Amino acid sequence: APQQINDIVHRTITPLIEQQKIPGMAVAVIYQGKPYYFTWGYADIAKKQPVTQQTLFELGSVSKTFTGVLGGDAIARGEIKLSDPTTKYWPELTAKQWNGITLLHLATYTAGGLPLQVPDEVKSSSDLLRFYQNWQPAWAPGTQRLYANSSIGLFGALAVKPSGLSFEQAMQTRVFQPLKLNHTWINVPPAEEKNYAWGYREGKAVHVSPGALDAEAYGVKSTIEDMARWVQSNLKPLDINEKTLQQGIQLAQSRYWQTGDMYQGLGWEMLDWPVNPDSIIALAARPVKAITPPTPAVRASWVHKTGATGGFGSYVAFIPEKELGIVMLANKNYPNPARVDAAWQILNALQ
Ligand SMILES: Cc1nc2cc(Cl)c(NS(=O)(=O)c3cccc(Cl)c3O)cc2s1
């Protein structure tokens, strides 16, 4: 643990934890390709269990990066194409508004205003069909971006249908296992419950509740060690031996749409490096410019994703051209600007 990394991390994170009243936190810094770990505070306040390198945190929407990569892998296998109509994999979706909506639109939140949340009343496969049949787009496909669990979640469910595998089994066999993410779960097994942190909302201990498309949109739980490995894999995809997975990682970092200074990948979001830190709301509708054709993964990028659940707040950011990255996992959902500011202070100091 180089003293420079130790100092910048502790001097940034200790006051962050104090100002945001974060019960427990884990951080990983990837520096020239090697990981360094830091932990603070409590995974379980009532039982006085500390955060360790083996503590499981809810990733929330950082799960979408896994979904994006899994979709990329299915593309590289020739099982799906992003230019395919949604109805090719869901022929029961017969309502006319779906004409022209492709898997790419689902993956990138550009289908025309699919909502942020699947309603709680929607549980079954027939419930889901009915919800998507009744949905009325506000916009033509590929004209505006609206961040939505119901968009990329449906992409994830459809992308695995040609494989014959359940979404969870596809994610285990095709992403977690090849990358040796052996403590990363869509469903936490009983054997691992001792390591599953509690989230804290309004001082109450909480875990994410089941929902439709939860696995695909916000369902992953992981340790700081596995998340460091995830960052390493996304920094250097060419070191990965599985060919379609290497390609799927590259596809998830391609630039498909631009809004302002940001580019939309599959799960991942990207900005050009170096980034103005100030350049990095319940509903924010933004017009998008198509990138025709998509730009292949730009090594000189700030690639990132925020994530939240009711009780958890996560952030991942990395810069491929510098072999540099960071993961911040906390069991309180605290404001996104504070996450990005801390991450930028650390990475800027080290670059
Ligand atoms: C009071 C709250 N309850 C929940 C429950 C969940 Cl499941 C999520 N996760 S999310 O996938 O839908 C999500 C949505 C928008 C932004 C982010 Cl960064 C995110 O992760 C967030 C919150 S906030």
Both structure tokens of 105:
């639109």
Please tell me whether residues 228 and 316 are part of one structural domain: yes
Query: What is the number of structural domains in the chain?
Result: 2
Would you say 333 is a known binding-site residue? yes
Q: How far is the CA of 321 from the centre of ligand 1 (A)?
A: 30
Distance of CA 185 to the CA centre of its chain: 14
CA distances from 198 to 88, 125, 203, 217, 225 (A): 41, 30, 11, 20, 18
Read off the tokens for 303: 């690639």
Of 72, 148, 159, 67, nearest to 111 by C-alpha is: 148
For residue 69, is it within any domain? no
Residues 19 and 102 both lie in one domain: no
Comparing CA positions, the residue from 63, 39, 65, 62 lying closest to residue 51 is 39
Q: Is 60 in the pocket of ligand 1 (CB under 6 A)?
A: yes
Residue written as token pair 């490995």: 229
| Atom 21 in ligand 1: residue holding the nearest Cα | 309
Q: Phi-psi category of 253—alpha, beta or left, where left has phi over 0 and alpha has psi -120 to 50?
A: alpha
Looking at 163, 184, 218, the residue that finishes a domain is: 163
Q: Is 319 exposed, middle or buried (0-12, 13-18, 19+ CB in 10 A)?
A: buried
Q: List the helix and strand counts (H, then E) for the chain.
A: 10, 17
Query: Distance between CA 103 and CA 71 in Å, rounded?
Result: 10
**99 located within any domain:** yes
CATH number at residue 188: 3.40.710.10
Residues 6+ away with beta carbon under 8 Å from 164: none
Method: X-ray
Cα angle 59, 116, 335 (rounded to 5 degrees) comes to 50
36 falls within a domain: yes
Q: Which residue has the tokens 């630039």?
A: 255
Residue 197 lies in a domain: yes
- For 147-196, the three-class secondary structure string (H helix, E strand, C coil) is CCHHHHHHHHHHHCHHHCCCHHHHHHHHHHCCCCCCCEECCCCHHHHHHE
Q: Do 195 and 252 lie in a common domain? A: yes
Tokens representing 37?
A: 């770990």
Q: Are residues 18 and 109 in the same domain?
A: no
From the CB of 206, is ligand 1 less than 6 Å away? no
Closest CA to 118 of 201, 221, 210, 220: 210
The answer to whether position 129 is within a domain reads yes
133 is known to lie in a ligand binding site: no
Tell me: cis bond preceding 274? Omega within 30 of 0 counts. yes
133 and 192 share one domain: no
Distances (CA, A) of 306 to 15, 102, 222, 267: 20, 25, 15, 10
Both tokens assigned to 46: 């009532």
Q: Domain ends where: 115, 139, 163?
A: 163
Q: Is the CB of 109 under 6 A from ligand 1?
A: no
Distance (Å) of CA 56 to CA 25, 59, 221, 225: 11, 9, 6, 10
**CA distances to 12, 26, 90, 262, 317 from 347, in Å:** 11, 16, 43, 19, 9
Catalytic-residue membership of 61: yes
CB count in 10 Å sphere of residue 47 = 10
Closest alpha carbon to 149 in 86, 252, 60: 60
Does residue 271 share a domain with residue 200?
yes
Q: Is 61 annotated as a binding residue?
A: yes
Q: Are 317 and 185 in contact (CB under 8 A)?
A: no
- Do residue 178 and residue 322 come from a single domain? yes
Closest ligand 1 atom number to CA of residue 336:
18
Ligand-binding annotation for 308, yes or no, is yes
CB atoms within 10 A of CB 239: 10
Give me 90's structure tokens: 């869901």
Report the DSSP beta bridge partners of residue 259: 262
For residue 131, give its domain range: 75-163
The finding on whether 8 has its CB within 6 A of some atom of ligand 1 is no
Do 135 and 174 have their domain in common? Answer: no
Does residue 68 sit within a domain? no
Whether residues 122 and 226 share a domain: the answer is: no
| 323 and 215 in a common domain | yes
Query: CA nearest 43: which of 58, 59, 24?
Result: 24
Instruction: Give the start-end residues of each E strand in the chain.
Output: 24-31, 34-44, 49-50, 57-58, 144-145, 184-185, 199-201, 204-206, 221-222, 255-259, 262-264, 269-272, 286-287, 289-295, 301-309, 312-319, 324-330
Experimental resolution (Å): 1.7
End-to-end CA distance of the chain: 16
Residue 177 belongs to some domain of the structure: yes
Query: Which residue, judged by its Cα, is nearest atom 1 of ligand 1?
Result: 310
Q: Cα–Cα distances in Å, from 289 out to 11, 242, 255, 259, 292?
A: 40, 33, 11, 7, 9
Alpha-carbon gap, residue 324 to 33, rounded angstroms: 7
Q: Which ligand 1 atom is nearest residue 308's CA?
A: 20
Q: How far apart are CA 2 and CA 14, in angstroms?
A: 18
| Final residue in a domain of this structure, among 163, 191, 213 | 163
The answer to whether 9 touches 346, Cβ cutoff 8 Å, is yes
Check if 268 has its Cβ closer than 6 Å to any atom of ligand 1: no
Ligand 1 contact via 208 beta carbon (within 6 Å)? yes
Residue to mutate, 218, 316, 332, ligand 1, most ligand atoms under 8 Å from C-beta: 218
Same domain membership, residue 139 and residue 38: no
Task: Find, among 60, 147, 163, the residue nearest to 106 by Cα.
Answer: 147
Q: Does residue 146's CB lie within 6 angstroms of at least one atom of ligand 1?
A: no
> Do residues 191 and 338 share a domain?
yes
**Distance of CA 314 from the midpoint of ligand 1 (Å):** 11
